[PDB]
UniProtKB/Swiss-Prot annotation, chains D, E, F:
Organism per entry: Homo sapiens (Human)
Protein name as catalogued: Insulin A chain
Spans traversing the lipid bilayer: none
Coiled coil ranges: none
Cysteines paired by S-S bonds: 6-11
Highest taxon, organism lineage: Eukaryota
Amino acid sequence: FVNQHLCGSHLVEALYLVCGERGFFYTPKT
Amino acid sequence: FVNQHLCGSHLVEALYLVCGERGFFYTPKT
Amino acid sequence: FVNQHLCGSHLVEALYLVCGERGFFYTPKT
Amino acid sequence: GILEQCCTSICSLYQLENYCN
Amino acid sequence: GILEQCCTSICSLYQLENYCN
Amino acid sequence: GILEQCCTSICSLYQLENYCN
Ligand SMILES: [Cl-]
Ligand SMILES: [Zn+2]
């Protein structure tokens, strides 16, 4: 299954919400 | 994994769609 | 769990993005 | 609740309807 | 179908492209 | 990274905050 890929979609949407105008970097690094 | 948390996101989006102007209460209660 | 149902939601959103004005058919057929 | 009922297996529009006001 | 192919493992943009009209 | 930390278990708003610029 693609658990990680689906989860990541929700993560950036949460970052978009929490980080606001400040923005954020998304680097899927182990 | 966060199956439940991810699923719940889709649930409220479905409730938003099905319930319309009536609205809905979301209470994650076992 | 509803892995497939949740995944499919993200799939059509991806098709919407990749296919653009051309559109697409979504037929969950095994 | 709705999490146990609808994340375990799929809820139909009719089942979701019962969660609406 | 697309569910078996793209929910089991990730589909690339190129693979998704083949589902477009 | 954020995938291992927040997809394994839930990250709080406070944890997410630390990923913001
Ligand atoms: Cl999901
Ligand atoms: Zn999702």
